[PDB]
Design a protein around this ligand. Structure first.
Ligand SMILES: O=C(CP(=O)(O)O)O[C@@H]1[C@@H](OP(=O)(O)O)[C@H](OC(=O)CP(=O)(O)O)[C@H](OP(=O)(O)O)[C@H](OP(=O)(O)O)[C@H]1OP(=O)(O)O
Ligand SMILES: Nc1ncnc2c1ncn2[C@@H]1O[C@H](COP(=O)(O)OP(=O)(O)O)[C@@H](O)[C@H]1O
Ligand SMILES: [Mg+2]
Ligand SMILES: [Mg+2]
Ligand SMILES: [Mg+2]
Length: 317
């Protein structure tokens, strides 16, 4: 049997999307799925972790990535989502830097790094209707993101012509994803990426790859629009159908390969006749789509089989 190891926090390992997918991967005749217990992940040295031939593992809050890396180094499994890239995925500066290098369209941006030691020694000048970040001008509206990709406190600053003030996004709480603030001045402590605001039709397109040749997309109301979450009958955020164009499929292919995340979530902004990548989140499943559960499990199982069947002497075509 080929052993597929699943190594992530229990929150993720026991989520419905995960359970739906693992159950289908298990229908592969030569595959056995082992889900590492959270207790073992956090408290046992890697030497005691289960063996696997293929490792599916990803960082979310609380996950000891260092131990996942050390485990993979010890056992040398076939790695579905590269572990070291997951340090970089946590850092918007590194994410954006990879996108530029791969020739992927993204918003014009500039990084403001504030060294925690110095009192006031940053490269930032603020006007009423713009900022200058290391000399680079951004007219409002512009977007201000914490350099930590796990920090979802993204601010949008409105131009005086639109009434000034700001929109503060956050991790969804109930009916809301953002709120208006009369505050017009940028945040004064911490490091941030500043970027041009890309005018979309008020939705974000969310893309989910499973390998570089398969990508499901769907749209959701932009959190910055007014902050009210559209919910269905069952209190799940309303999603709208999307079909990617040729440019966007190529984008999905590049993102999946550039970050070495077979399973990969990222966000597109359809603006000005193009599509811009504004966020790459790594390992991420589509929810509430039976067909995605089927495709994803099938693709992953196929990848596993293609990769490992020869050394296991299993016929596979
Ligand atoms: O928002 C919620 C609560 P709800 O899903 O409304 O019950 O869960 C988010 C999940 O949202 P959705 O796709 O709408 O279900 C969030 O997912 C999204 O927002 C969609 P995407 O993953 O960003 O494409 C996201 O889930 P995944 O990363 O597991 O997908 C969040 O996980 P986190 O980032 O906090 O670890 C997860 O929060 P939590 O359940 O508190 O951990
Ligand atoms: N450059 C931009 N122009 C216009 N809207 C943006 C831009 N960047 C982000 N947004 C909006 O803000 C939301 C959150 O920003 P994102 O980069 O996805 O951060 P997070 O990692 O918290 O999701 C996006 O879903 C999108 O609606
Ligand atoms: Mg099986
Ligand atoms: Mg996002
Ligand atoms: Mg993100």
């Amino acid at each position: 049997q080929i052993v597929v190891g699943i190594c992530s926090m229990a929150k993720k390992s026991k989520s419905k999307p995960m359970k739906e997918i693992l159950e289908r991967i298990s229908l592969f005749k030569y595959i056995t799925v082992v889900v590492f217990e959270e207790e073992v992940i956090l408290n046992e040295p890697v030497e005691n972790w289960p063996l696997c031939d293929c490792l599916i593992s990803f960082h979310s809050k609380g996950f000891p990535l260092d131990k996942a890396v050390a485990y993979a180094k010890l056992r040398n499994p076939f790695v579905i989502n590269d572990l070291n890239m997951q340090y970089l995925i946590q850092d918007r500066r590194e994410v954006y830097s990879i996108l530029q290098a791969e020739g992927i369209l993204l918003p014009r941006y500039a990084i403001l790094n504030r060294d925690p030691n110095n009192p006031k020694e940053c490269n930032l000048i603020e006007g009423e209707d713009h900022v200058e970040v290391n000399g680079e001008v951004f007219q409002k509206p512009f977007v201000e993101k914490p350099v930590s990709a796990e920090d979802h406190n993204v601010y949008i600053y409105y131009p005086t012509s639109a009434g000034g003030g700001s929109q503060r996004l956050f991790r969804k709480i109930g009916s809301r994803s953002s709120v208006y603030s009369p505050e017009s001045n940028v945040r004064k402590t911490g490091s941030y990426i500043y970027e041009e605001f890309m005018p979309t039709d008020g939705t974000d397109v969310k893309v989910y790859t499973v390998g570089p040749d398969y990508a499901h997309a769907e749209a959701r109301k932009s959190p910055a629009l007014d902050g009210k979450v559209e919910r269905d009958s069952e209190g799940k955020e309303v999603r709208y159908p999307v079909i990617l164009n040729a440019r966007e499929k190529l984008i999905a292919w590049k993102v999946c390969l550039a970050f070495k995340q077979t399973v990969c979530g990222f966000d597109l902004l359809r603006a000005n006749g193009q599509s811009y990548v504004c966020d790459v989140n790594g390992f991420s499943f589509v929810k509430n789509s039976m067909k995605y559960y089927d495709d994803c499990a099938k693709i992953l199982g196929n990848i596993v089989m293609r990769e490992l069947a020869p050394q296991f002497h299993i016929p596979w075509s």
